[PDB]
Write a protein that binds this ligand. Sequence first.
Ligand SMILES: *C(=O)/C=C/N[C@@H](C(=O)O)C(C)(C)S(=O)O
Length: 269
Amino acid sequence: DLADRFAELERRYDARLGVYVPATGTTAAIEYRADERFAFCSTFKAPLVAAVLHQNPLTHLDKLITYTSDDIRSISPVAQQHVQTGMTIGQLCDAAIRYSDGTAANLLLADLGGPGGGTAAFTGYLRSLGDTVSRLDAEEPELNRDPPGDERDTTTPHAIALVLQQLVLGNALPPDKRALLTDWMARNTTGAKRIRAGFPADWKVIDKTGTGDYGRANDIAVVWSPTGVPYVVAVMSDRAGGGYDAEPREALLAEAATCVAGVLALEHH
Ligand SMILES: *C(=O)/C=C/N[C@@H](C(=O)O)C(C)(C)S(=O)O
């Protein structure tokens, strides 16, 4: 069975794997360690952008945020490029999702909750969606670095998939805001070797990845069948076995996603 297959992925990559695919009308939930905690890493950036979208008119996307080289304390490919001229809130959302820019995320946290109030306000957004489990406690890059077992800055596959479901396939956001979030995730540049690699080309995939220390590699996606049937897929992993500098394994994620896609695509008439 599928649990046994997921277990064999864990043995082969010397990793811990978490999977959740919510139940639908026609399919049972897929759950593997689904209530175990894993570090968010950059996956929180998706609901962060929704938080900012939700709380503000679309005109707030035009607001120019200025920052300095001193505020760049994490890998920030887009923020580095715009450091002299600043970035709009809209540009920051784009950067945060599509490049996993760490400075962009920190600046959106300040915008949501003020300095020192951002991680609490982000977690409160999750609470506002009925997620009592997830918590963010630090900003970038510290949130990627807590040890195995620390509950800070964690979610569960179950919790983050149900949030993403609300955001993309529910009514947590009005249509016009919902469309921006979905466009950004659709245009993501960092996920080609993860959930995307597991689904056939005629399935549509949107995603947000995360990567961190202790071999952490995550991806959260929404996928659409060739006839437009939607599913939410969360895959989380770590490799605590090799300590802080353990190599993350994207191919573990691609494999877990391929197992999911088999169950989702394979009909039985
Ligand atoms: C989102 O998950 C961002 C993660 N960043 C880390 C990474 O592995 O990409 C580091 C190493 C850059 S962390 O920012 O110091």
